[PDB]
Amino acid sequence: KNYHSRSESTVENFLGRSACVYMEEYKTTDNDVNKKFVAWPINTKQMVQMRRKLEMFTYLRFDMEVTFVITSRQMPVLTHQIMYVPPGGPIPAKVDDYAWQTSTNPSIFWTEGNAPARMSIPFISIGNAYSNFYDGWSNFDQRGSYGYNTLNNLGHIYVRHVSGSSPHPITSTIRVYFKPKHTRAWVPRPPRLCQYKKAFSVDFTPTPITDTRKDINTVT
Amino acid sequence: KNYHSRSESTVENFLGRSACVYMEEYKTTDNDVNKKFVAWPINTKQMVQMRRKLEMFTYLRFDMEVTFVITSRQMPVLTHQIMYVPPGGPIPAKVDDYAWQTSTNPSIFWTEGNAPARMSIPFISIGNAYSNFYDGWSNFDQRGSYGYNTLNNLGHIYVRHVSGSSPHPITSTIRVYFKPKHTRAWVPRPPRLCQYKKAFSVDFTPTPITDTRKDINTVT
Amino acid sequence: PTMNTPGSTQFLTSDDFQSPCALPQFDVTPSMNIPGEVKNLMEIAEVDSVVPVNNVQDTTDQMEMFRIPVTINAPLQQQVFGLRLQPGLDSVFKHTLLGEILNYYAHWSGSMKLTFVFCGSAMATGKFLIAYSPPGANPPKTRKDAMLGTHIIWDIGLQSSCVLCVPWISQTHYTSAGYVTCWYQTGMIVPPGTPNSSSIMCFASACNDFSVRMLRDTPFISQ
Amino acid sequence: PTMNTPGSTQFLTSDDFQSPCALPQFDVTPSMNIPGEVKNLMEIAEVDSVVPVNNVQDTTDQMEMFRIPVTINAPLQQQVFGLRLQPGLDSVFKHTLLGEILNYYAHWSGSMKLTFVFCGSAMATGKFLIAYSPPGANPPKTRKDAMLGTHIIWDIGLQSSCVLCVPWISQTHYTSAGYVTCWYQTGMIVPPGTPNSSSIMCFASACNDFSVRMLRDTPFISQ
Amino acid sequence: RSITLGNSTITTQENVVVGYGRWPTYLRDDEDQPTQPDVATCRFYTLDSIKWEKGSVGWWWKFPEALSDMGLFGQNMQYHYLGRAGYTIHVQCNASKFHQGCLLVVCVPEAEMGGAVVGQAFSATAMANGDKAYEFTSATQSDQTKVQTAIHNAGMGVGVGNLTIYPHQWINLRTNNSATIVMPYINSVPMDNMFRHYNFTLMVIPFVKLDYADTASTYVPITVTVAPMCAEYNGLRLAQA
């Protein structure tokens, strides 16, 4: 052991890590149209560890990048339409409709046997920074939703399997990796001390501050 | 024959050679969870030849690189999660747990039919050089382990086959190659003259110094 | 002379490579100068935080954990509190600001600062012996033993804050750890019409500089 | 104008190519200046080492291998020892420092240095004829034959170290090899109250410079 | 003639073999981690006198455990935690001109020694135990709780003839009679706990057995004198605000 100095504690290389955030499966043929494609609203409040890190700041400004790892099991090459609907775009409600054919939705076409698909979504928002915490209401009558604003909203990623007239009976599994880039953070905030109970609320149940020991004078 | 000079005896290009160090197999489906993935603590005391070379020095400082050659036998492309747990990280105890999903463990994703996977681990240690030999105890009561310190410790490489909901009944075989880079060495030490009996001890049985001849005056 | 070399056709999940922009021809809303920009996680740890020194086995409420009790009646040689400096594993400092930042790392060292502030009546007076034991040393068992070591006689009458910068604070992953103890020297003396109890609060910081190396996940909130 | 040329999409297991760093954004502990840095394996071989000249067929213990015996009683023309210089295959030099370094290579040449130090009583005197035979030459069979060649008359009385730099030391992979022999010339003479035995130790080095070419594994420790 | 060295005790003697060409030196020659150089430690701590008999094999002393019970140095090891020191070792034997023998005085840094029975563990009392000259033995050792102690392999499995790499000096009774080896501090961490780690081991190996003729003293007394030089420790006091 010796002292020296640090530079691994800078905000950018603290919160900037690739981490899995969503994993889902889909089957190209079945009786449920819900399961013929994958939907995924982008948010960073699903992975508990990742959430806790980001919630030590109130305002955050970053442009993310999303990498997909797709595998498939049962013959020829198979292609995937990895569409990105940005906020206030049209969303598909079923596999094959005009919402897939929309030309304002950036859509990757990646075929298997090649290095993973990737794209870098920029800083979308009409605000000047995403806000993790919001202490307000959706309307000024104050009877609406609590702790929700639309300026921290991010789009949806919809993945479907590009198929011919009659699909195969294949099934695929996707995994999504998410990594902030060029992070800036403003206003620090105390760490969490309770276990999360909701993915959107700040709800908690009271818990003791710290673990107990036999006596104040007793230390071993 | 003629004289000239040398430059093949420098420390860097003596100890810096790619050499196989571990080979193991795993089956994705069976009744033993131990055999569904590969574990491997990194050390250079398994290949006898490689060991003998490195043990001619007491302190060594190097940053290694690890290349993997993976083959598989029984249809579609198959991907491998080649995770690196560094010292004091969480280790998976079974295939599929949160330790695989940890974002602080550098994990390659390599799919077959492409040039071998590789990464270069840097010089990890809080010391100022790995020490091959240690003449001490783990505690100052001197009743602990002998000839073991934690400052020469290196992480583990865990390899698993990225699979869908239900794996295939494939089986794979891995081979690991290991090569020091930018080696520096301090304090030289006499070569070994006994056959190794343990992979961590310096234990030996006495052996004669050299082979005998008929008479001191007799030379042929 | 090639880029098809082994180990350059993979997803290494820690890439520093640049990637295509999903939607170019889009203007971002330029940054605003919002108060309180953060540049390190170390700035967070250099803010003083109330440590819960008291945390007895049977604790009636959770707000008495920050209060070390001091009373009129108690012998002249008696111990007030004990601490073991190890701000990453000791229960006292485990969940403080300094504790939280430290647990995201696997190697750390430096110095910390402990301020002891008497929050009590404005008429009380007395003396205490805040004593420090080096890393190897055993905690003193009597006030006399404590006094031989390093000690500060903190006069409650003329001061109400005692700041102790402590060196040799390291990770240590039983253990060699310093100790801060405090002992009665005179007891608390009050004039008529004054309460017979007072308390001492305690604070902790990361002092001038600390150094943290190698990221790790917290072992607190479980996935 | 391509990098998809044949022979550039393989693992050649001796690559000098650079590769991605597993974890960047990690600070290494800077190097310390530790005594005795090594830069070549040749530095190791340039350190003198006790060679076991004596290694008779029936050897009672292993510590008498480093002692060449010299006694009061023995004819005036008698041979002390014989050596065949071939420091990579001859049993004498096989496991010395010089031997070990050499066996990791497949080509080597240069000169070696042999020092003969009489370790014995401080009252003994005598003379020896350390004789050298060229590579092609046969070892002498008598002291008279030996004396005609290259010989040094080493006086045990006025010196106690005889240093012989020997040239033409090569790999030779029977064999042409030099020979160093030593012969009695006067015998050992001692005054009353002195032991009737003494010994000669021997050392070996790699002299000013050697050159080693092409790596090879040792044929000693088996896998 | 006689260059009388004084420190706080006097040793009269009359080459210096530096460990690797590095003299002992303070770490300050290069708050958070203050140090406390103790400059009263140096002085000649003369160890016990072993007898070199005709039928003897060799001897070894673990450092710094040999000086664990020696005065101020011993005390500081108990008090302080982290400490670093270099040593000046004077191994002198006294013999006549009718005695013949050879010794290899060698300082071996970090020597790990295997057990007598392969795959067994032994206690710390089998290597060091205050100031004692542990004795190497001829042939094998079959006592389970002992170190291997076979002279020809030096108890490390390296071959005894090759120990000449390490800083060594030969005491040939024919000519010289003194060996001065100035060992510097060699470790991979700036300073370490002096109980856990045995930094180096001094070995005296007789390569030629003593022959004393007749009606002369049957032993040659070998005395070891160790002076710890430039010993630094860790501060025990708090820093400023």
Side-chain angles (χ1 to χ4, degrees):
Chain A
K1 213 72 172 185
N2 203 22
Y3 183 50
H4 311 103
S5 57
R6 76 305 188 184
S7 189
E8 295 191 59
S9 56
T10 54
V11 177
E12 181 169 4
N13 66 19
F14 177 70
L15 299 172
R17 296 292 175 171
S18 295
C20 184
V21 287
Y22 188 66
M23 298 184 281
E24 188 51 62
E25 68 180 358
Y26 53 110
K27 308 185 187 299
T28 47
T29 49
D30 60 351
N31 298 340
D32 190 7
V33 180
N34 290 249
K35 178 56 63 175
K36 293 182 182 178
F37 62 103
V38 170
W40 163 235
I42 300 172
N43 61 346
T44 42
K45 303 187 67 174
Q46 299 314 111
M47 181 182 190
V48 180
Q49 186 54 70
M50 173 65 155
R51 177 173 180 172
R52 190 179 198 262
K53 290 196 301 183
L54 294 158
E55 285 188 349
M56 293 184 60
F57 301 103
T58 310
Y59 306 113
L60 290 168
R61 177 184 176 92
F62 57 91
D63 54 305
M64 62 225 75
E65 76 178 1
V66 183
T67 314
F68 308 94
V69 176
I70 301 178
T71 60
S72 183
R73 61 185 307 288
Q74 185 53 256
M75 274 184 74
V77 298
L78 306 176
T79 312
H80 299 291
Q81 188 174 0
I82 306 176
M83 175 171 71
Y84 176 52
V85 177
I91 64 298
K94 301 184 304 304
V95 52
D96 299 348
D97 71 335
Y98 181 66
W100 293 103
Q101 308 310 116
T102 301
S103 56
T104 64
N105 295 348
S107 188
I108 318 177
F109 285 91
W110 170 92
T111 190
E112 297 190 303
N114 294 268
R118 176 180 294 192
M119 56 181 163
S120 176
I121 304 172
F123 176 65
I124 44 166
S125 179
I126 55 176
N128 300 65
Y130 307 122
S131 51
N132 294 358
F133 294 92
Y134 183 71
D135 183 13
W137 300 86
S138 58
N139 61 354
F140 46 92
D141 295 349
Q142 304 179 101
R143 315 190 186 282
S145 187
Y146 177 63
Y148 173 69
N149 63 345
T150 55
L151 307 181
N152 62 3
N153 192 34
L154 300 169
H156 293 255
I157 301 173
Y158 290 97
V159 179
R160 174 256 285 180
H161 171 269
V162 178
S163 52
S165 55
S166 182
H168 299 305
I170 58 88
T171 178
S172 301
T173 303
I174 184 159
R175 309 184 179 241
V176 186
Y177 286 80
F178 187 96
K179 161 167 170 290
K181 302 190 300 186
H182 307 99
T183 321
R184 304 180 66 183
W186 327 77
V187 183
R189 175 173 297 272
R192 185 66 173 200
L193 203 76
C194 302
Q195 303 182 321
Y196 301 96
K197 299 301 193 67
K198 293 292 183 294
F200 298 103
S201 309
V202 69
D203 299 349
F204 65 104
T205 52
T207 43
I209 311 185
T210 194
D211 301 342
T212 51
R213 59 181 177 173
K214 295 175 58 176
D215 186 22
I216 188 167
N217 302 133
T218 291
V219 69
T220 300
Chain B
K1 213 72 172 185
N2 203 22
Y3 183 50
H4 311 103
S5 57
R6 76 305 188 184
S7 189
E8 295 191 59
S9 56
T10 54
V11 177
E12 181 169 4
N13 66 19
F14 177 70
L15 299 172
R17 296 292 175 171
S18 295
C20 184
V21 287
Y22 188 66
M23 298 184 281
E24 188 51 62
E25 68 180 358
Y26 53 110
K27 308 185 187 299
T28 47
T29 49
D30 60 351
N31 298 340
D32 190 7
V33 180
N34 290 249
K35 178 56 63 175
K36 293 182 182 178
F37 62 103
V38 170
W40 163 235
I42 300 172
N43 61 346
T44 42
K45 303 187 67 174
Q46 299 314 111
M47 181 182 190
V48 180
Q49 186 54 70
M50 173 65 155
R51 177 173 180 172
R52 190 179 198 262
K53 290 196 301 183
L54 294 158
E55 285 188 349
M56 293 184 60
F57 301 103
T58 310
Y59 306 113
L60 290 168
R61 177 184 176 92
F62 57 91
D63 54 305
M64 62 225 75
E65 76 178 1
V66 183
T67 314
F68 308 94
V69 176
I70 301 178
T71 60
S72 183
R73 61 185 307 288
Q74 185 53 256
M75 274 184 74
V77 298
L78 306 176
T79 312
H80 299 291
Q81 188 174 0
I82 306 176
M83 175 171 71
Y84 176 52
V85 177
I91 64 298
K94 301 184 304 304
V95 52
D96 299 348
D97 71 335
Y98 181 66
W100 293 103
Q101 308 310 116
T102 301
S103 56
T104 64
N105 295 348
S107 188
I108 318 177
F109 285 91
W110 170 92
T111 190
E112 297 190 303
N114 294 268
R118 176 180 294 192
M119 56 181 163
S120 176
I121 304 172
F123 176 65
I124 44 166
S125 179
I126 55 176
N128 300 65
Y130 307 122
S131 51
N132 294 358
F133 294 92
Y134 183 71
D135 183 13
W137 300 86
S138 58
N139 61 354
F140 46 92
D141 295 349
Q142 304 179 101
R143 315 190 186 282
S145 187
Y146 177 63
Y148 173 69
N149 63 345
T150 55
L151 307 181
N152 62 3
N153 192 34
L154 300 169
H156 293 255
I157 301 173
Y158 290 97
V159 179
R160 174 256 285 180
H161 171 269
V162 178
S163 52
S165 55
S166 182
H168 299 305
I170 58 88
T171 178
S172 301
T173 303
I174 184 159
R175 309 184 179 241
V176 186
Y177 286 80
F178 187 96
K179 161 167 170 290
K181 302 190 300 186
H182 307 99
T183 321
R184 304 180 66 183
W186 327 77
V187 183
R189 175 173 297 272
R192 185 66 173 200
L193 203 76
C194 302
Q195 303 182 321
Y196 301 96
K197 299 301 193 67
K198 293 292 183 294
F200 298 103
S201 309
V202 69
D203 299 349
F204 65 104
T205 52
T207 43
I209 311 185
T210 194
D211 301 342
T212 51
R213 59 181 177 173
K214 295 175 58 176
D215 186 22
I216 188 167
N217 302 133
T218 291
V219 69
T220 300
Chain C
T2 45
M3 65 290 300
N4 291 348
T5 51
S8 56
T9 171
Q10 61 191 122
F11 170 38
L12 184 52
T13 189
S14 51
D15 295 7
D16 292 348
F17 299 124
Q18 192 46 249
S19 51
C21 199
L23 36 142
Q25 308 317 115
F26 171 72
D27 292 355
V28 295
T29 308
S31 55
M32 176 178 174
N33 181 12
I34 301 178
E37 183 161 47
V38 185
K39 298 294 190 179
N40 289 256
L41 275 283
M42 285 305 311
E43 290 174 50
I44 306 187
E46 292 167 12
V47 179
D48 299 1
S49 183
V50 190
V51 319
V53 177
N54 177 287
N55 48 1
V56 290
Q57 194 54 250
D58 183 11
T59 182
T60 305
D61 64 349
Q62 301 302 292
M63 281 292 282
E64 281 178 357
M65 291 189 177
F66 302 112
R67 305 174 193 157
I68 301 173
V70 175
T71 45
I72 301 297
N73 299 117
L76 296 172
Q77 303 186 106
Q78 190 53 252
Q79 191 171 358
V80 189
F81 63 91
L83 288 171
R84 173 170 56 82
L85 302 183
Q86 173 46 44
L89 299 169
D90 186 31
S91 186
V92 174
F93 304 91
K94 190 163 73 289
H95 294 295
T96 65
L97 291 179
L98 178 64
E100 295 288 0
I101 298 295
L102 292 177
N103 277 221
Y104 279 112
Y105 292 91
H107 302 286
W108 42 261
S109 52
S111 303
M112 65 187 291
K113 177 202 304 181
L114 292 94
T115 92
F116 293 99
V117 177
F118 178 88
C119 295
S121 48
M123 292 294 190
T125 45
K127 295 182 177 296
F128 294 127
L129 285 185
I130 308 178
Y132 169 62
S133 300
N138 298 336
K141 300 303 189 299
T142 50
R143 185 192 63 76
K144 171 61 58 175
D145 188 11
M147 179 273 287
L148 301 174
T150 305
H151 65 286
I152 298 176
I153 317 184
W154 171 33
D155 195 1
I156 319 165
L158 302 174
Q159 291 299 334
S160 54
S161 181
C162 198
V163 179
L164 291 81
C165 185
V166 189
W168 291 291
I169 306 302
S170 298
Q171 170 62 287
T172 61
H173 187 279
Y174 177 47
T175 52
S176 52
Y179 296 91
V180 172
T181 51
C182 182
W183 302 83
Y184 284 97
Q185 169 59 247
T186 302
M188 182 164 65
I189 301 170
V190 292
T194 305
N196 295 350
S197 187
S198 296
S199 301
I200 295 172
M201 298 183 69
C202 179
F203 296 82
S205 196
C207 214
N208 305 340
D209 56 15
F210 229 82
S211 57
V212 298
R213 295 180 295 280
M214 187 165 76
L215 235 293
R216 190 183 66 188
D217 65 338
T218 29
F220 293 129
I221 305 297
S222 303
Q223 180 55 57
Chain D
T2 45
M3 65 290 300
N4 291 348
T5 51
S8 56
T9 171
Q10 61 191 122
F11 170 38
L12 184 52
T13 189
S14 51
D15 295 7
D16 292 348
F17 299 124
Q18 192 46 249
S19 51
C21 199
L23 36 142
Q25 308 317 115
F26 171 72
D27 292 355
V28 295
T29 308
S31 55
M32 176 178 174
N33 181 12
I34 301 178
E37 183 161 47
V38 185
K39 298 294 190 179
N40 289 256
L41 275 283
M42 285 305 311
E43 290 174 50
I44 306 187
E46 292 167 12
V47 179
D48 299 1
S49 183
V50 190
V51 319
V53 177
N54 177 287
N55 48 1
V56 290
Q57 194 54 250
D58 183 11
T59 182
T60 305
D61 64 349
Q62 301 302 292
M63 281 292 282
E64 281 178 357
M65 291 189 177
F66 302 112
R67 305 174 193 157
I68 301 173
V70 175
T71 45
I72 301 297
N73 299 117
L76 296 172
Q77 303 186 106
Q78 190 53 252
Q79 191 171 358
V80 189
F81 63 91
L83 288 171
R84 173 170 56 82
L85 302 183
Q86 173 46 44
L89 299 169
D90 186 31
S91 186
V92 174
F93 304 91
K94 190 163 73 289
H95 294 295
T96 65
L97 291 179
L98 178 64
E100 295 288 0
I101 298 295
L102 292 177
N103 277 221
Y104 279 112
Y105 292 91
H107 302 286
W108 42 261
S109 52
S111 303
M112 65 187 291
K113 177 202 304 181
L114 292 94
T115 92
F116 293 99
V117 177
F118 178 88
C119 295
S121 48
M123 292 294 190
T125 45
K127 295 182 177 296
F128 294 127
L129 285 185
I130 308 178
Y132 169 62
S133 300
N138 298 336
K141 300 303 189 299
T142 50
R143 185 192 63 76
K144 171 61 58 175
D145 188 11
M147 179 273 287
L148 301 174
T150 305
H151 65 286
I152 298 176
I153 317 184
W154 171 33
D155 195 1
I156 319 165
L158 302 174
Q159 291 299 334
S160 54
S161 181
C162 198
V163 179
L164 291 81
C165 185
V166 189
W168 291 291
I169 306 302
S170 298
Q171 170 62 287
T172 61
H173 187 279
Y174 177 47
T175 52
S176 52
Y179 296 91
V180 172
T181 51
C182 182
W183 302 83
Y184 284 97
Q185 169 59 247
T186 302
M188 182 164 65
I189 301 170
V190 292
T194 305
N196 295 350
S197 187
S198 296
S199 301
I200 295 172
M201 298 183 69
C202 179
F203 296 82
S205 196
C207 214
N208 305 341
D209 56 15
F210 229 82
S211 57
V212 298
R213 295 180 295 280
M214 187 165 76
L215 235 293
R216 190 183 66 188
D217 65 338
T218 29
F220 293 129
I221 305 297
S222 303
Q223 180 55 57
Chain E
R1 282 69 51 74
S2 42
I3 176 167
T4 53
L5 309 175
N7 281 339
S8 301
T9 37
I10 189 167
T11 280
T12 181
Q13 54 83 64
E14 177 68 67
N15 290 123
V16 179
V17 176
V18 185
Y20 287 103
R22 292 285 298 282
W23 293 92
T25 187
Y26 287 118
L27 191 58
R28 297 180 290 110
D29 179 10
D30 53 343
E31 27 71 60
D32 182 20
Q33 298 186 116
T35 48
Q36 184 192 293
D38 196 345
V39 201
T41 44
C42 64
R43 58 190 297 277
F44 298 118
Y45 296 98
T46 303
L47 308 182
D48 60 3
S49 186
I50 48 168
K51 292 191 298 182
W52 180 6
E53 294 192 60
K54 170 175 291 177
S56 60
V57 177
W59 298 277
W60 81 87
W61 299 258
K62 294 297 195 178
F63 281 89
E65 304 316 298
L67 306 177
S68 63
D69 299 346
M70 298 289 170
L72 179 57
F73 201 71
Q75 291 182 7
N76 291 347
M77 288 169 55
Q78 297 169 349
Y79 295 151
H80 295 84
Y81 188 46
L82 305 178
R84 61 197 301 279
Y87 303 88
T88 296
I89 309 185
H90 293 94
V91 180
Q92 301 175 49
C93 61
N94 301 109
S96 59
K97 296 185 177 181
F98 295 117
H99 292 317
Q100 53 172 249
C102 192
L103 298 176
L104 177 56
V105 184
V106 61
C107 296
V108 178
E110 291 181 350
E112 193 184 303
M113 303 184 168
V117 175
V118 176
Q120 291 301 324
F122 49 90
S123 185
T125 199
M127 304 194 86
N129 181 23
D131 180 16
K132 284 174 51 57
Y134 282 75
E135 292 183 59
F136 286 119
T137 55
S138 188
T140 69
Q141 185 60 70
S142 300
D143 187 5
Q144 181 279 125
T145 195
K146 291 299 299 79
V147 178
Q148 183 55 66
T149 59
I151 187 56
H152 54 90
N153 280 357
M156 298 165 59
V158 294
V160 68
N162 297 142
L163 296 177
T164 46
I165 304 190
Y166 307 121
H168 65 125
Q169 193 166 5
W170 290 93
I171 303 180
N172 185 1
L173 293 184
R174 194 176 184 284
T175 42
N176 71 139
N177 288 117
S178 184
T180 307
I181 311 179
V182 178
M183 195 63 178
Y185 182 73
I186 313 183
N187 198 16
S188 57
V189 180
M191 42 177 63
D192 196 21
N193 187 9
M194 309 195 83
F195 280 120
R196 285 195 285 95
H197 186 52
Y198 308 153
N199 197 15
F200 66 96
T201 181
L202 178 66
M203 306 188 187
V204 171
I205 301 176
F207 266 75
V208 177
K209 293 193 293 74
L210 189 74
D211 294 340
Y212 47 71
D214 184 30
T215 59
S217 188
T218 57
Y219 61 91
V220 164
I222 315 173
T223 48
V224 182
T225 286
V226 186
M229 291 305 312
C230 299
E232 192 158 58
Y233 296 105
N234 66 110
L236 303 176
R237 305 193 298 187
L238 308 182
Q240 303 307 109

